[PDB]
């Protein structure tokens, strides 16, 4: 080997691991605070406060709700034929036309909201024997009276309101959404003045369905000078089917159809400012970053978003246990 290898010394080698002065507490199966070298937060808890206008198509409703934009309230005429990935409805929106109510408001708002378009096609309905284009001073369009742009109020001609019986075939290859309504007069006098018959009736049908609504006379609270109301209804007509509108008084007739589509559109109630930035996840509180897996900003979201969770903090340990060597 060598010869008498006599140098009798020894050495010491010690293994160890790092430690940091700071360190983070994390939860465990057995401990709920144990300190580790480093951790990463998994719950997104803050919004920018602004809805980024990119990548989704944000349509700001300004002072229009989506249903008034649909019906064509004069002040929402800005939105005709408009489209959106997300329609934002603001708390300040107001209606300002003939007082109306929508029996299942909630479904019509949904159904339009996810169709994502207000594209309107006018169709040639021929109403023979009645006066068309009725308007009201509670729905001012410009200096004059007015009514919803997408609806057509029929009243008597001379001394008669005939039984209207019109039909419109769906010959295209897409579904057609028709919005129509019925006018509820305040007094029997109002009823006969406008529609002659002392009891109106509207029946709208397809091969598949039918709705017959009869009006209801009576005073409601004064809203924009009126005690009357109109109630809004809708009918989808499938390709190849046919719409038949049959009425004997009180019909608020459709002027054509909205076309329907299938997409990723939806509506959101939010007073957050829209701003220019790209962000995939939208919350009524503004956009948030979807880099973390969970979020605690809001349970309402649109887009690629973290899963909402009740916790506002969940730290994932990304390091070993911190066992400091003093702590400095």
């Amino acid at each position: 080997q060598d010869l008498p290898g006599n140098d009798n010394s020894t050495a010491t080698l010690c293994l160890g691991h790092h430690a940091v002065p700071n360190g983070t507490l994390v939860k465990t199966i057995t401990d709920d605070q144990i300190e580790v070298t480093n951790a990463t937060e998994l719950v997104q808890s803050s919004s920018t406060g602004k809805i980024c206008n990119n990548p989704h198509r944000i349509l700001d409703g300004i002072d229009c709700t989506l249903i008034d934009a649909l019906l064509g309230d004069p002040h929402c005429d800005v939105f005709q034929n408009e489209t959106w990935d997300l329609f934002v409805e603001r708390s300040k929106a107001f209606s300002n036309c003939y007082p109306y109510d929508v029996p299942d408001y909630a479904s019509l708002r949904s159904l339009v909201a996810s169709s994502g378009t207000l594209e309107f096609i006018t169709e040639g309905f021929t109403w023979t024997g009645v006066t068309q284009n009725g308007r009201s001073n509670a729905c001012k369009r410009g200096p004059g009276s007015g009514f919803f742009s997408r609806l057509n109020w029929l009243t008597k001609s001379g001394s008669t309101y005939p039984v209207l019986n019109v039909t419109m075939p769906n010959n295209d290859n897409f579904d057609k959404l028709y919005i129509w309504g019925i006018h509820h007069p305040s007094t029997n006098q109002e009823q006969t003045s406008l529609y002659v018959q002392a009891s109106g009736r509207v029946t709208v049908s397809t091969r598949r369905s039918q709705q017959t609504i009869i009006p209801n006379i009576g005073s409601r609270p004064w809203v924009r000078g009126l005690s009357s109301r109109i109630s809004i209804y809708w009918t989808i007509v499938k390709p190849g089917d046919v719409l038949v509108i049959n009425s004997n008084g009180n019909l608020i007739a459709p002027r054509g159809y909205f076309k329907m589509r299938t997409g990723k559109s939806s509506i959101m109630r939010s007073d957050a400012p829209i701003d220019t930035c790209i962000s995939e996840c939208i919350t009524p509180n503004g956009s948030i970053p979807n880099d973390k897996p969970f979020q605690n900003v809001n349970k309402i979201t649109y887009g690629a978003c973290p899963k909402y969770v009740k916790q506002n903090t969940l730290k994932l340990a990304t390091g070993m246990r911190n066992v400091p060597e003093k702590q400095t």
Binding site: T12, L13, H18, G319
Partner: protein, 175 residues
Amino acid sequence: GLFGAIAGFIENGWEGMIDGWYGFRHQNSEGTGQAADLKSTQAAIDQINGKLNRVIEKTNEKFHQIEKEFSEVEGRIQDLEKYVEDTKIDLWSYNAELLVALENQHTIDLTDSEMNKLFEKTRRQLRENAEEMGNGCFKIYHKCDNACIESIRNGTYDHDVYRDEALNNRFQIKG
């Protein structure tokens, strides 16, 4: 944790080791020195990143859903809308809470494991020439200069080269 190296037989960490997660300090002929071990440092880091990336794998996207805030009182259907969402949130919250608890528990045992594996690996290499002082340090029973310490660290140490010197020093003595 499960292996009892970290916060176990190794009393505490070294706030001074800034170049890696696991490593060696020695005291020898030429003095004292420290050095991080990069292979176990990388093994611990890769596993934790792998775990991390799996957790950040795809936020799924959702578009039109159900209403979750209501302004009027409606009864039966709105009670259901509220109950579907509230039971959805509690189930996802349970999931997030359990996931980070299992995850963290495992990250502490995994890093415990790598410390212990580096220890065992060094033990194995020194063969009959060192003894374990029981606190994560070996007493090397032969003259081992800085190049000898570097060969243990870079894993090329040949025990045979020092075996008789070591066995003499270690056993013989006077008993």
